[PDB]
Design a protein around this ligand. Structure first.
Ligand SMILES: CNC(=O)[C@@H]1C[C@H](N2CCc3c(ncnc3OCCC3CC3)C2)CN1C(=O)c1ccc(CN)c(OC)c1
Ligand SMILES: [Ca+2]
Length: 223
């Protein structure tokens, strides 16, 4: 997160860190045994880390649970990132508490101007690199689809939205992908891609979760 602020420990209790010996992606807890992340985060040997604040320190509220099954969206395209969403089932249920809590799925799609909370452990610099270890937060609005498509001609699909600031300075960045975009208590987005971080006219691009709620619910109910 570039241009954000320190969330505060366990203030984003649905935020997870996906760890394969190191933090590689964010995710969102959606019930005790399932996490939503980006399909581009798919890999073997995932451990889901819940209840984290500083990812380099065991502070006493963490739960570490291995993934048992990963389900990449049936239509995910790795060349274009269309349908950039995946479900991860945990080997055992997380114990739900004040520090480890699920986030609601949308019941409808959110609009341009809706304010959201984006969070993650990614790079905090727009030029060069610095990783914060504690969770960072950013308040950002959803941008109109026309400004998103104009910023990224030929690359934005009906399954994506832009959020952030066209003037630059505030954005998600390397190591935030897979993590949450939450608006009025609903997981509307997944951190997906962009061109650089916090550059003018290059806002972050996010998977449009509302289009996937039917698939998420059906997949969870059958697995
Ligand atoms: C260490 N983790 C990372 O670096 C991940 C990998 C992810 N990338 C996306 C493109 C892509 C991937 N995997 C196959 N193909 C990819 O792109 C192919 C081209 C299609 C049009 C996207 C995976 C971008 N990452 C971010 O954390 C990130 C988050 C937010 C922003 C917004 N400023 C950002 O901006 C550059 C980057
Ligand atoms: Ca921690």
């Amino acid at each position: 997160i570039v241009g954000g602020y320190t969330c505060g420990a366990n203030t984003v209790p649905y935020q997870v860190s996906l760890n394969s010996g190191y933090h590689f992606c964010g995710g969102s807890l959606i019930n005790s045994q399932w996490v939503v992340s980006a399909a581009h985060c798919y890999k073997s040997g995932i451990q889901v880390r819940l209840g984290e604040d500083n990812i380099n320190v065991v502070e006493g509220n963490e739960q570490f649970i291995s993934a048992s099954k990963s389900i990449v969206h049936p239509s995910y395209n790795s060349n274009t990132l269309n349908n950039d969403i995946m479900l991860i089932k945990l080997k055992s249920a997380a114990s739900l508490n004040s520090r480890v809590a699920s986030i609601s799925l949308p019941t409808s799609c959110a609009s341009a101007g809706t304010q959201c909370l984006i969070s993650g452990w990614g790079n905090t610099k727009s030029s060069g690199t610095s990783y914060p270890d504690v969770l960072k937060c950013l308040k950002a609005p959803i941008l109109s689809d026309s400004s998103c498509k104009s910023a990224y001609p030929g690359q934005i699909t009906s399954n994506m939205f832009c959020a952030g600031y066209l003037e630059g300075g505030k954005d998600s960045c390397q190591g935030d992908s897979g993590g949450p975009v939450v608006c009025s208590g609903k997981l509307q987005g997944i951190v997906s891609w962009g061109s650089g971080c916090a550059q003018k006219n290059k806002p972050g691009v996010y998977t449009k979760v509302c289009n996937y709620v039917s698939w998420i619910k059906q997949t969870i109910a059958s697995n």
